[PDB]
Design a protein that fits this description.
Largest interface: A-B, 24 and 23 residues
Largest sheet of chain C: 2 strands, antiparallel
Radius of gyration of chain C: 15 Å
Distance between the termini of chain C: 23 Å
Shape of chain C: elongated
Function (chain E): Flagellin is the subunit protein which polymerizes to form the filaments of bacterial flagella.
Strand content of chain A: 15-25%
Protein name (chain C): Flagellar hook-associated protein 1
Family (chain E): Belongs to the bacterial flagellin family.
Structural class of chain C: mainly beta
Protein name (chain E): Flagellin
Order of helices and strands of chain A: HEE
Number of helices of chain A: 1
Order of helices and strands of chain C: HEE
Subcellular location (chain E): Secreted; Bacterial flagellum
Radius of gyration of chain A: 15 Å
Strand order of the largest sheet of chain C: 1-2
Helix content of chain C: under 10%
Oligomer: part of a larger assembly
Strand content of chain C: 25-35%
Chain lengths: 50, 50, 50, 50, 50
């Protein structure tokens, strides 16, 4: 488990994540304006219909 | 849209997050059932799950 | 560390941010006790009858 | 490009170099300025005005 | 050194200084009293709100 612990240490040492003030998602970089983070995520029942 | 294509009106659950100069935010505000309030990192997930 | 803050990431814990230390001698007769809260951390302790 | 020397409230020194696009409004800069300071939204260190 | 991407680049460790062409401030704990008032009357002379 510890070798994963360092990976998180990198996250802590590198980037900022937050469950923002009204439960939306807000995330900040420690250094940059121009920083190349982009996410798209999907749920098992995203989309399709009967 | 989540691919990068156009997020038409029917692309409800199909979009990226929303960037700012130094930070990004996901725009949907996750609310605990009934609470109209919001979760913490150390909050278990079932309180919101549809 | 205690991680009752619900992490399995016990770096958010009392021990990470403060620590205590006792001392007593074995050949002269001295004794002392010390505690250390690291930078960014103030601490206070409260009692139930102790 | 912008080039910098800064010294922190504790006192430790730091230089910086970063790019600037032509259409940077001060707000765009004032959004980076937080990261540039380490004045992250998660943890303020200074308060600014123009 | 380059690049100086908007993912701002930084250096640290300039250790001391003696005299410099540096930033400016009006506030502090200590005082110089008469000359300060004289300096302030200069602001009246210059009309310096700024």
């Amino acid at each position: 488990y510890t070798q994963i612990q360092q990976l998180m240490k990198d996250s802590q040492a590198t980037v900022d994540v937050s469950m923002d003030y009204k439960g939306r998602i807000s995330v900040t970089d420690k250094l940059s304006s121009g920083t190349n983070i982009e996410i798209s995520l999907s749920d098992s029942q995203s989309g399709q219909f009967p | 849209d989540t691919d990068g294509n156009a997020a038409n009106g029917a692309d409800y659950d199909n979009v990226y997050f929303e960037k700012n100069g130094n930070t990004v935010y996901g725009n949907v505000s996750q609310v605990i059932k009934g609470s109209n309030a919001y979760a913490t990192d150390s909050t278990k997930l079932s309180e919101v799950m549809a | 560390n205690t991680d009752d803050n619900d992490n399995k990431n016990s770096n958010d814990d009392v021990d990470d941010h403060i620590n205590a230390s006792f001392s007593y001698d074995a050949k002269t007769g001295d004794g002392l006790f010390q505690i250390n809260a690291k930078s960014g951390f103030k601490v206070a302790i409260e009692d139930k009858g102790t | 490009t912008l080039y910098v020397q800064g010294t922190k409230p504790d006192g430790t020194s730091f230089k910086s170099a970063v790019l600037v696009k032509p259409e940077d409004t001060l707000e765009d800069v004032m959004e980076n300025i937080g990261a540039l300071y380490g004045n992250t939204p998660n943890n303020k260190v200074v308060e600014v005005s123009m | 050194a380059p690049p100086f991407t908007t993912t701002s680049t930084v250096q640290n460790g300039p250790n001391f200084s003696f005299s410099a062409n540096n930033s400016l401030t009006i506030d502090e704990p200590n005082v110089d009293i008469i000359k300060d008032l004289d300096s302030m009357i200069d602001a009246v002379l210059k009309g310096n709100m700024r």
